[PDB]
């Protein structure tokens, strides 16, 4: 029950309350085990606990799969430092240690509560009799699969062994499963559901993407006569919520070419607002020093270029549209990460859109020369372009592409606030283009 899971989390994670009500629901569903559950959260949201808690709650020896051995080691260490029973059947284990782990899994009453194994290990013939014995004795309480998005080629990560993990799910069908993912699109979610052969009735727990504190708005460089002045005005309005509050937060700007970021930073400094390029060409020491300077309030807005994170950032200017819509959302997430309100602004231009499309096509062709991933990234770029040109609720488009529940943003959305202005901007773009 609720008390049992709360006590288990206090003993393991030491959290007085769950990170999010979605985590409550996902953990309840996993503990119930009535059917599979597909739960997705961003990194750092304690998504692993959703399967760690029920795995220990159930008497059966739960088994989980993760792609990386560095990852598997990190989670095993994190569970060990919390006294949580855990083991790894990776090839790194010494011959004697590997045999001991195999015997412990094979023998009745496995000592390990949750056992992590790399996807290829489940395909290894050595573990086959072990899995047969566990399924015969229904020793596998739950079968969670970390990084479930790797099964789908459209996701940022792909692993050929997740196809075999699907067949493994086909085994021990009596026990349910838990599918984790950092960022899963509805197409990716459907692909994961179909490949893993999960029992069709599944409770999906995906965090909504709208940020009541965050605000979005798209701008057209051609429409604005002085885009630099518009950016300066946006920075001035964002760095201070009120006159008494004064300057607060930080700012970041992205670009594809280091020279572009250098020029943008030079222009910003000329205007009056301090800004450092922080581009890749800048040496490592200089880059980290610029990042540290931007962390404090000394630099109202420091150009980030390829990479930034920061606790609270007021805005994130996108002079050049991102390569992927999901990538753009992740870039904007660090903006306003704290509970304070934030304002996000894009700078979409036809020339920049064409340039990024050409670069993406060239990259896809190069990758194909050495196919599904190219199509997926092209689709992400097209979705980002549509978001830029979509004349409607921005959070609605974000939810549509990520497939999470649509938003109800009464305030904090440009389209929902002044739809007439959005229509006017769209008409202006159409006349210009």
């Amino acid at each position, epitope marked *: 029950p609720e008390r049992r899971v709360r006590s288990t989390l206090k003993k393991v994670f030491g959290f007085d309350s769950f990170k999010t009500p979605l985590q409550e629901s996902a953990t309840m569903a996993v503990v119930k085990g009535n059917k599979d559950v597909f739960v997705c959260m961003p990194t750092g949201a304690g998504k692993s606990l959703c399967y760690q808690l029920p795995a220990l709650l159930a008497k059966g020896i739960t088994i989980v799969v993760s792609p990386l051995i560095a990852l598997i080691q990190d989670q095993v260490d994190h569970l060990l430092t919390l006294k949580v029973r855990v083991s790894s059947l990776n090839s790194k284990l010494s011959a004697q240690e590997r045999k001991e782990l195999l015997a412990d899994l094979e023998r009745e009453k496995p000592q390990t509560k949750i056992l992590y194994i790399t996807p290829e290990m489940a395909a290894s013939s050595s573990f086959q009799p072990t899995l047969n014995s566990l399924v015969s004795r229904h020793l596998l309480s739950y079968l969670v699969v970390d990084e479930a998005h790797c099964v789908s080629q459209w996701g940022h990560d792909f692993r050929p062994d997740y196809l075999r993990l699907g067949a493994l799910r086909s085994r021990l069908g009596h026990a349910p499963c838990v599918a984790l993912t950092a960022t899963a699109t509805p197409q990716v979610q459907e692909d994961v559901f179909a490949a893993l052969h999960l029992k069709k*009735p599944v409770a*999906i727990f995906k965090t909504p993407c709208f940020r009541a504190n965050l605000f979005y708005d798209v701008q057209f460089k051609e429409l604005i006569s002085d885009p630099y002045g518009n950016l300066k005005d946006f920075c001035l309005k964002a760095l201070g919520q009120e006159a008494d509050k004064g300057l607060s937060g930080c700012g970041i700007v992205y670009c594809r070419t280091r020279e572009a970021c250098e020029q943008l930073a030079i222009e910003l400094s000329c205007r009056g607002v301090n800004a450092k390029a922080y581009h890749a060409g800048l040496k490592a020491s200089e880059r980290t020093l610029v990042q540290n300077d931007w962390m404090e309030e000394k630099v109202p807005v420091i150009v980030a270029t390829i990479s930034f994170d920061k606790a609270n950032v007021r805005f994130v200017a996108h002079w050049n549209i991102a390569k992927s819509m999901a990538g753009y959302y992740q870039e904007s997430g660090r903006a306003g990460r704290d509970g304070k309100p934030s304002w996000c602004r894009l700078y979409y231009s036809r020339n920049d859109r064409d340039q990024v499309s050409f670069l993406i096509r060239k990259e896809v062709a190069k990758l194909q020369e050495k196919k599904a991933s190219d199509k997926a990234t092209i689709m992400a770029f097209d979705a980002l372009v549509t978001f830029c040109e979509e004349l409607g609720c921005r959070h609605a488009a974000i939810a549509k592409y990520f497939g999470d*529940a*649509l938003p109800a943003c009464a305030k904090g959305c440009d389209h929902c606030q002044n739809p007439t202005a959005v229509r006017r901007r769209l008409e202006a773009l159409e006349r210009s283009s």
Partner: nanobody
Amino acid sequence: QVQLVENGGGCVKAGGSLRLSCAASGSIFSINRMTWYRQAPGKEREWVAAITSGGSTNYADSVKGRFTISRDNAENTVYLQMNSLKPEDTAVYYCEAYGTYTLAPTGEGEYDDYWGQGTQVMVS
């Protein structure tokens, strides 16, 4: 939760025509594919046709000559158009909506498919 309902079921003479409409209830993002099924008293269920997102359609040659399916994801509604009806296709038509995907602000969802009540048809 999602609920399915049939609309436009009735017996007509040979060579007649009508439409069987199926919709959904609640908040649904997108159905993987809507798959009608024909099953009658004493008759085993048979895969009659199916429509998936993007416009791709699957069916049987005999049923193709008989009927034709077409659905819209935005409307989340699938229509089976009855034309040149014959007394052989007299089975109750159930609406599958294979691969339903539900969303809520709380984040809780449901991937299970929901089957409709359906309706039969007869011919002289």
